[PDB]
Every structure is written in structure tokens, then in C-alpha cells.
Design a protein around this nucleic acid. Sequence first.
DNA 1: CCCGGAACTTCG
DNA 2: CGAAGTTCCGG
Length: 71
Amino acid sequence: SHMLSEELRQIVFRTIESLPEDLRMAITLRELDGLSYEEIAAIMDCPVGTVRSRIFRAREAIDNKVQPLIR
DNA sequence: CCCGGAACTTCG
DNA sequence: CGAAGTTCCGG
């Protein structure tokens, strides 16, 4: 309820939620399901290299919403 | 603009 | 070394 640390966790969830389906799924399978890149690539039927960038780019989007928040 | 993937780099 | 993570040349 409005304390900074609380604003930050909500910002993380909210940003994951608004990501493009592929980025959201790739970051979700990695962070919440704890899957390996290999596994995620099978689930998403795509090259693992695409999993690498998708996860990278999903992380970037989360960080661009979080960094403007700390100190 | 929004990323796809593979090369390249770091980490466990 | 194998998995995770970073970068870049496209398309």
C-alpha cells in the first residue's frame, strides 16, 4: 500500500503482464517455472538463441521501469 | 520500431 | 565444459 518496496514489486508484475506474448512467456517460464533455455525453446518451439534475446529483452523492459525508481 | 537468431562472453 | 547471459547484424 504505497511504500516504495511495494511499488517496486507491483511494477515488476505489471510490466511482465504488458509484455508481448512471446517475451512474457519466455521470461515467465524462466523466472517462475525455473526452466532452462533448452526447455523453454522446446516449449516455445523456437531456437534457443531466440529464447536468449527474448529473455534479455523482457528483462530490459522490466529494468527500464524499475531503475527510474531506486535512489 | 520490434525484435530473430546466431556469434560471442561470462558464470557455475 | 555446459548453461546462462550479452551483443549485433540484419529483416
